[PDB]
Amino acid sequence: CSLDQTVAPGNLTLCGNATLFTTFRPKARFIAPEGWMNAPMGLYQRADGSIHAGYQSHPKHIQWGNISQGAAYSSDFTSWTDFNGSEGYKTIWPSQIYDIRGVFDGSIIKEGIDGYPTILYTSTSFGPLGATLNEAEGTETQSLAYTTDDGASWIKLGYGAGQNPVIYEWPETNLTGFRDPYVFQSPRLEALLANTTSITNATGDHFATISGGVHGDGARLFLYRQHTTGEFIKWTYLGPLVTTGYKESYGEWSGNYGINFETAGVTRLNPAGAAWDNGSDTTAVDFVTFGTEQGRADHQNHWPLWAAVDYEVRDNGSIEAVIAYSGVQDWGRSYAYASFPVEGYRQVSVGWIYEDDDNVILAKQFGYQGAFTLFRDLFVKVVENVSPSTPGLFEQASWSTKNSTDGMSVTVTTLGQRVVPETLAAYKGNSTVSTLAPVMLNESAAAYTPFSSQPTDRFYALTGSFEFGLNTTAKAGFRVLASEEEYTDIWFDPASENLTVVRTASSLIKSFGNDTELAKVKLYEIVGAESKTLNLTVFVDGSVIEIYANDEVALSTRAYPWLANSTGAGLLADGTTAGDVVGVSGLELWDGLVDAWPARPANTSQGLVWDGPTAAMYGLFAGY
Amino acid sequence: CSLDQTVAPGNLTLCGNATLFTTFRPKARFIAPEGWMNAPMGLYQRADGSIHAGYQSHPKHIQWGNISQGAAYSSDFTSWTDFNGSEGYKTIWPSQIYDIRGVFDGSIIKEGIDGYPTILYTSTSFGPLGATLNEAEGTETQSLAYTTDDGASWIKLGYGAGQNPVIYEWPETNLTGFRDPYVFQSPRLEALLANTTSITNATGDHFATISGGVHGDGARLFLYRQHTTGEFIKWTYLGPLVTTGYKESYGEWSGNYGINFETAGVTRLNPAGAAWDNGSDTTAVDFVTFGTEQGRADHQNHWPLWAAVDYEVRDNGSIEAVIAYSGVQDWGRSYAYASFPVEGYRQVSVGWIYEDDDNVILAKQFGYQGAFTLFRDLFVKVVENVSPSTPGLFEQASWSTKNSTDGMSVTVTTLGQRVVPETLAAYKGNSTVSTLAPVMLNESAAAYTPFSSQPTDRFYALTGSFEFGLNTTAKAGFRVLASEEEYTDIWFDPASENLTVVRTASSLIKSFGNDTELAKVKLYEIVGAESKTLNLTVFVDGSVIEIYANDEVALSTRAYPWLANSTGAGLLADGTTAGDVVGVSGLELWDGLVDAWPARPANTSQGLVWDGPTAAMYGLFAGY
Ligand SMILES: *[C@@H]1O[C@H](CO)[C@@H](O[C@@H]2O[C@H](CO)[C@@H](O[C@@H]3O[C@H](CO[C@H]4O[C@H](CO[C@H]5O[C@H](CO)[C@@H](O)[C@H](O)[C@@H]5O[C@H]5O[C@H](CO)[C@@H](O)[C@H](O)[C@@H]5O)[C@@H](O)[C@H](O[C@H]5O[C@H](CO)[C@@H](O)[C@H](O)[C@@H]5O)[C@@H]4O)[C@@H](O)[C@H](O[C@H]4O[C@H](CO)[C@@H](O)[C@H](O)[C@@H]4O[C@H]4O[C@H](CO)[C@@H](O)[C@H](O)[C@@H]4O[C@H]4O[C@H](CO)[C@@H](O)[C@H](O)[C@@H]4O)[C@@H]3O)[C@H](O)[C@H]2NC(C)=O)[C@H](O)[C@H]1NC(C)=O
Ligand SMILES: *[C@@H]1O[C@H](CO)[C@@H](O[C@@H]2O[C@H](CO)[C@@H](O[C@@H]3O[C@H](CO[C@H]4O[C@H](CO[C@H]5O[C@H](CO)[C@@H](O)[C@H](O)[C@@H]5O[C@H]5O[C@H](CO)[C@@H](O)[C@H](O)[C@@H]5O)[C@@H](O)[C@H](O[C@H]5O[C@H](CO)[C@@H](O)[C@H](O)[C@@H]5O)[C@@H]4O)[C@@H](O)[C@H](O[C@H]4O[C@H](CO)[C@@H](O)[C@H](O)[C@@H]4O[C@H]4O[C@H](CO)[C@@H](O)[C@H](O)[C@@H]4O[C@H]4O[C@H](CO)[C@@H](O)[C@H](O)[C@@H]4O)[C@@H]3O)[C@H](O)[C@H]2NC(C)=O)[C@H](O)[C@H]1NC(C)=O
Ligand SMILES: *[C@@H]1O[C@H](CO)[C@@H](O[C@@H]2O[C@H](CO)[C@@H](O[C@@H]3O[C@H](CO[C@H]4O[C@H](CO)[C@@H](O)[C@H](O[C@H]5O[C@H](CO)[C@@H](O)[C@H](O)[C@@H]5O)[C@@H]4O)[C@@H](O)[C@H](O[C@H]4O[C@H](CO)[C@@H](O)[C@H](O)[C@@H]4O[C@@H]4O[C@H](CO)[C@@H](O)[C@H](O)[C@@H]4O)[C@@H]3O)[C@H](O)[C@H]2NC(C)=O)[C@H](O)[C@H]1NC(C)=O
Ligand SMILES: *[C@@H]1O[C@H](CO)[C@@H](O[C@@H]2O[C@H](CO)[C@@H](O[C@@H]3O[C@H](CO[C@H]4O[C@H](CO)[C@@H](O)[C@H](O[C@H]5O[C@H](CO)[C@@H](O)[C@H](O)[C@@H]5O)[C@@H]4O)[C@@H](O)[C@H](O[C@H]4O[C@H](CO)[C@@H](O)[C@H](O)[C@@H]4O[C@@H]4O[C@H](CO)[C@@H](O)[C@H](O)[C@@H]4O)[C@@H]3O)[C@H](O)[C@H]2NC(C)=O)[C@H](O)[C@H]1NC(C)=O
Ligand SMILES: OC[C@H]1O[C@@](CO)(OC[C@@]2(OC[C@@]3(O[C@H]4O[C@H](CO)[C@@H](O)[C@H](O)[C@H]4O)O[C@H](CO)[C@@H](O)[C@@H]3O)O[C@H](CO)[C@@H](O)[C@@H]2O)[C@@H](O)[C@@H]1O
Ligand SMILES: OC[C@H]1O[C@@](CO)(OC[C@@]2(OC[C@@]3(O[C@H]4O[C@H](CO)[C@@H](O)[C@H](O)[C@H]4O)O[C@H](CO)[C@@H](O)[C@@H]3O)O[C@H](CO)[C@@H](O)[C@@H]2O)[C@@H](O)[C@@H]1O
Ligand SMILES: *[C@@H]1O[C@H](CO)[C@@H](O)[C@H](O)[C@H]1NC(C)=O
Ligand SMILES: *[C@@H]1O[C@H](CO)[C@@H](O)[C@H](O)[C@H]1NC(C)=O
Ligand SMILES: *[C@@H]1O[C@H](CO)[C@@H](O)[C@H](O)[C@H]1NC(C)=O
């Protein structure tokens, strides 16, 4: 096997384990030291202000199995340090009959057992497990563990009656799934339920949702309430919080609700960030975020969605979250978004970006799979003075509209997402920053125009504001990871409202995915404006391309160019003329970003192992 | 609930957990501190000469489950000390996907991994498990662990390819079972296989049997050989060592071979004890000991058997053990005999005595279930100058006969069993010993004649030699645990050759078993003798009654009299007359025996617990 990146790639399947470890690997984001990772889990801000991040982990393997919590910490979301204990960077692992099949996703009770941070997680045991299988009660249960050393280790409650698992009875029959407990406090829900606590006897200050669905009848998010404040064993099922139909879609801007929910969370936001009011803040909005499965033909059958909801109290002392509008958290190769509270009235969200090697052709050669997204502040995005002639504005798809008294302008409300400012500041400050001159794209514009300053490697950020005419048919955007022979094109086409990532030339290596990514972006036209603007920011980090538009739309994807010089970037233009012009301004290149794992050497592989012939006998894990 | 043992028992099912802990509990033998125990395991003589004894254990429960190795040690087989570590008296427990369903029986490689004592044990995982179920490959595998601290703790090899489990492929299809690996060295088998090692490539100095069978086609003992000396991962299947038919019986003296073997072992003995010759000792005999299941209507469907075998070498480099004669290791409520080598050319055997509460009526009230038998030296019993007119002598059922040159006398050979002398010496020396006058049982004999000295509690031993006429129809024996209203009768009836334990009056508590126990005993008549003699020794230890006849026949059973004064003992006589007389001599009572667990308080209960509703969901363990 040749690793010569100045010539065409050979047959890379002949290369040894982890021989391509550094070739495509992100350096500026959260990623496991090696091996398989998936969903973020156990996220919390520790007492010292640092962030604890857990993740679903299978060290020394490149497929899922024996799933455990790997963990690390950071003071700024950006520069991280691994925990190191008796199980390396793992801090929770399968060890008991109730969780031996996997320590699945879980979330944090900050003041839990004996006052310590406490995780409620899905403990899995034997049997068919999956939304398309005939799962039985007991295969997925919910269990507790607590930490006396700020996440270096966790102590599980004992197995048995009145101990672990703490939630095991299915709340309804024929579930498609029963996992991913999300624990949260909610002055809002407490106020809504306060007149019904005699019906249920549940008066605790923590709520928990469990994600699932019902066979043949769509997804469900089940709401539990802690029975008594300061006691963590008894959780009382109230009722279904979110109920959607079998492969129901709210429309083109909203993905598809599939057959089963995963990793669902509940939050309340206002324009500044997290809102902890009881309903009295008229600017605050209740949101649910959730993954759905089997409602999508590609992207591992997974949609990471969100919905704004209006809560209604049922007669039996439960809550119906009625969906008001519904959107997409990320349109690309990401899933399993977890959100958590951060000091200063913030709610921060992070997800998992999977690879684009679904046939597992070069996974062993990588020696790892997966990374996180960047950490994102959630908030209510409010756009004032929106023109009523904005096309499709009153579909109110993934946004709400409020007319002015005179009917001449509209206020638009939707979910806002932006990269946490700590990361943007660290990235910019550690990079070589080039502030680029504005560019008018007209009849003289080439299809591709390289920036006047170029990246030096596969670790950079780009930003720009693209000003379009209101009736434009021109397209513009950014080309990244570019040489003559390999490149990835990020286009926005205002006439169709489509942001695309064209990957037909992303790599000479043909086994990686090359399908076109697509997001919908609504340019809310402002009253009196004779143009409409797209603010586009792109992070390039090894193989990750993570795109943000207007602090609203996110699209994560993957590109794996072979050639060492496929690092360039610049502007894309199509159909720009003397009359149909695209003005690009606020252009900036940040070359280098940050080394996110300063204590790690370049190659943190420990090799790969095979579980042997028993893996197929047990039938639980691939074994590699 | 009343614990008044001076009046009739009330409804004892109303009593709390462990309220009857001391009432019926053995004090002079190996028993767990509390809870459930079954099979002995991991038996070995440590480097300091002490004995390490493991056992199948489920603390704080009174039914089987989460099965683990509990352990203790002794310098003399008699006075024991518990290990105490992070898991109390447990030293191996379910902890990995491959053994999470139970750490089943295993045996010791004394010089194993890195020179340390090493256990090869059955590691169980999920799925139907049992001889009457449809078990699949992987549910029972065989795994290694080693100890660096003389049995205080064990370190398992890692899970995976080339590590644990080390034996997982079924050697034949449709097995009824695949467990209880018995590792042993054998100069005999090495010599027999030495000319065939090119066929198999297996040249190690350790052999291992695995116990099982084939659906519809009887039991099997599978023989493996360590592939290479000093290496413990690779074990090569040679072939079936013992093959018996579906519920085949060798006859009235031999139990029934059932459908599946459990806890099988292989040894070689001579008249003095263990034999380590290569075949050159003409006095040595090869033996297999084994449990069988589903060949018996009662006694938990279990026979603990043994067979003398003659080894034949197969063309494919394996061994057929052809059964020469076949007997019973214990005729009562015991099973799961394990044997192990002890210094001074000894092979020592010990089994598990279960309770007689098969409907689980008072198990919670006990707070424990099970004990060991006494430890027994195995040897070849040889009886010289046997008269050819001994009835049924040439059936050669569970013995062999060799005629003298002149045909006027016979040498009889069979398996000998006797209590280890360390235990007999300690028992006698710590007891109040009464040497009783000989008694002729004739026309004046009462049905029951109390001994001139009486026991003071339920912990004593009796011995006597009963001399019968060659054509007697009289019966005699011992009554034990006796008051006016409760008693247990041990009879021998030479005319039928039956040793019985009649338990119709054993207890006023009606929920315990009351069926009559039965053993066959052959009194080998000596040339020139005008009488035949039964040497009968009985140990009474709480509820255990353990009977030995002629250092050959063993019968363990249970009696649970309620009354505090049901402790007496004496002679039984039936049909003795002026002409048909039974002479009893060598009579001795040992009152008190030994406190086998001197560091333990009287009540070592830690209470009982319930696993909760998930026990029924997982379906593996009762949960209590
Ligand atoms: C099948 O069998 C399995 C094996 O038996 C079984 O698993 C075992 O289950 C039991 C029962 O649930 C578990 O026991 C619990 O353990 C908890 C602690 O767990 C952590 O620590 C242990 C032991 O720690 C040591 O040993 C290891 C090994 O050598 C070392 O690594 C450590 O350094 C440490 O060593 C020191 O201590 C040793 C002696 O113990 C010394 O020898 C040594 O020199 C050192 O000094 C670890 O083994 C655990 O690891 C395992 O589990 C983790 C996950 O948790 C895994 O990641 C890991 O891989 C291992 O599998 C773990 O790290 C105990 O806290 C717990 O005791 C509490 O609960 C019980 C009730 O259940 C009470 O009786 C008890 O009193 C305790 O409750 C009190 O305290 C807590 C807080 O401390 C309070 O919340 C509570 O309210 C209560 O308060 C009381 O006291 C207060 C203070 O005084 C007072 O204020 C209050 O008022 C009140 O009175 C319990 O002992 C055991 O860990 C499992 N073991 C394993 C290996 O899994 C399995 O379940 C069975 N399966 C089935 C299906 O049945
Ligand atoms: C799902 O995930 C699970 C979790 O990841 C996974 O289970 C884990 O599997 C791994 C991999 O198999 C296991 O790792 C092995 O561990 C062996 C030791 O195991 C014992 O000790 C550990 C750790 O001990 C400490 O930590 C605990 C907890 O705090 C304390 O209680 C102890 O006191 C002790 O603490 C000290 O050390 C800590 C740091 O480690 C310090 O922080 C602390 O301050 C103290 O100083 C225990 O956790 C184990 O307990 C568990 O298992 C037991 C049963 O074994 C249970 O009863 C218990 O409940 C727990 O479950 C246990 O007690 C290692 O020996 C082993 O490493 C050897 O093998 C690997 C290859 O596999 C080699 O890479 C490595 O080099 C070692 O091999 C060398 O050494 C041996 C002899 O020592 C030689 O035989 C060998 O040939 C080789 O020799 C080499 O070195 C020689 C010397 O230099 C040289 O001469 C030679 O030439 C040669 O070079 C390995 O690390 C891990 O234990 C499992 N953990 C658990 C919790 O189960 C599970 O499998 C996964 N499942 C699936 C389906 O995938
Ligand atoms: C003495 O020791 C015991 C341990 O053995 C210990 O714990 C008790 O253990 C017994 C079992 O021995 C448990 O009994 C079972 O209880 C089930 C119902 O339990 C519910 O109601 C109870 C009564 O109010 C509550 O106490 C329970 O609370 C505990 O558990 C919950 C979790 O559910 C936990 O949140 C709490 O904190 C408590 O820990 C609980 O709410 C019964 O379903 C079960 O019934 C079986 O057994 C009966 C008697 O044999 C039958 O009548 C039933 O039909 C059924 O048995 C059948 O058996 C067949 C054959 O196997 C099978 O095929 C059928 O399907 C069926 O199962 C049983 O009665 C008891 O709950 C438990 N108590 C606890 C934990 O508090 C004691 O605490 C200990 N005492 C002391 C003082 O220490
Ligand atoms: C690089 O990293 C790997 C870990 O990923 C590590 O270990 C190797 O891992 C691979 C899997 O990635 C193993 O491959 C499998 O091997 C099976 C046969 O193995 C036997 O032959 C080998 C070749 O001589 C031996 O090396 C093996 O020895 C080891 O294992 C034994 C225990 O059996 C142990 O005693 C020894 O000590 C060694 O540890 C062993 O004797 C194959 O059956 C298996 O085949 C599957 O995959 C193929 C390729 O995809 C297909 O062609 C097959 O059809 C089959 O896949 C199918 O998949 C579908 C879909 O899932 C399924 O439905 C079908 O049923 C079917 O399964 C596979 O090839 C490899 O054995 C293992 N090597 C080891 C442990 O040494 C490497 O060591 C590491 N390299 C380095 C240098 O570190
Ligand atoms: O680690 C468990 C936690 O992860 C979640 C959230 O993702 O559950 C994920 C889940 O499967 C993930 C898995 O499967 C996906 O990809 C497959 C191949 O394209 C596709 O067929 C599946 O429909 C899709 O779910 O991802 C990897 C491959 O990327 C694959 O090996 C995994 O199965 O994990 C559970 C058990 O595998 C599944 O039920 C579940 O969908 C969260 O819900 C869990 O807590
Ligand atoms: O601990 C596992 C090791 O023990 C052995 C040797 O005994 O396997 C025993 C075994 O079952 C023991 C068990 O069942 C017996 O009693 C039942 C009730 O009378 C009867 O129906 C069964 O046929 C008989 O096997 O004993 C207790 C009750 O005394 C009961 O709970 C147990 O099942 O353990 C395995 C799993 O339970 C069985 O497959 C096996 O027969 C040894 O072979 C194991 O290493
Ligand atoms: C990039 O590398 C390729 C292969 O070495 C080469 O053909 C090309 O000219 C290089 N330079 C570029 C794209 O500027
Ligand atoms: C409360 O009512 C809802 C709507 O009928 C139902 O789905 C839920 O199961 C009920 N909650 C209970 C029974 O706890
Ligand atoms: C909102 O404004 C638009 C444009 O003026 C108008 O068509 C629509 O009827 C208004 N809606 C309401 C509720 O007044």
Ligand SMILES: *[C@@H]1O[C@H](CO)[C@@H](O)[C@H](O)[C@H]1NC(C)=O
């Ligand atoms: C570089 O990044 C580090 C780690 O995130 C950060 O702490 C530091 O402030 C950055 N340097 C700058 C902004 O000069």
Ligand SMILES: *[C@@H]1O[C@H](CO)[C@@H](O)[C@H](O)[C@H]1NC(C)=O
């Ligand atoms: C824009 O995207 C939609 C999917 O939402 C698709 O149907 C349509 O064809 C696209 N149009 C163009 C011009 O890209």
Ligand SMILES: *[C@@H]1O[C@H](CO)[C@@H](O)[C@H](O)[C@H]1NC(C)=O
């Ligand atoms: C034994 O105890 C019972 C009940 O207290 C009593 O009736 C009997 O007389 C006692 N004495 C004996 C058997 O010698």
Ligand SMILES: *[C@@H]1O[C@H](CO)[C@@H](O)[C@H](O)[C@H]1NC(C)=O
């Ligand atoms: C050796 O021969 C015997 C008798 O045919 C057979 O049962 C056994 O499986 C053979 N051993 C092998 C194939 O290893």
Ligand SMILES: *[C@@H]1O[C@H](CO)[C@@H](O)[C@H](O)[C@H]1NC(C)=O
């Ligand atoms: C053994 O001795 C008996 C009695 O003398 C005789 O009947 C029998 O035939 C003898 N057997 C042999 C093999 O000589």
Ligand SMILES: *[C@@H]1O[C@H](CO)[C@@H](O)[C@H](O)[C@H]1NC(C)=O
């Ligand atoms: C009493 O028993 C102990 C423990 O088995 C033993 O060591 C001691 O020798 C015995 N006492 C005698 C024989 O006097």
Ligand SMILES: *[C@@H]1O[C@H](CO)[C@@H](O)[C@H](O)[C@H]1NC(C)=O
């Ligand atoms: C002796 O035991 C056998 C069972 O081996 C039985 O068939 C026979 O009836 C018994 N006879 C007497 C008199 O007890």
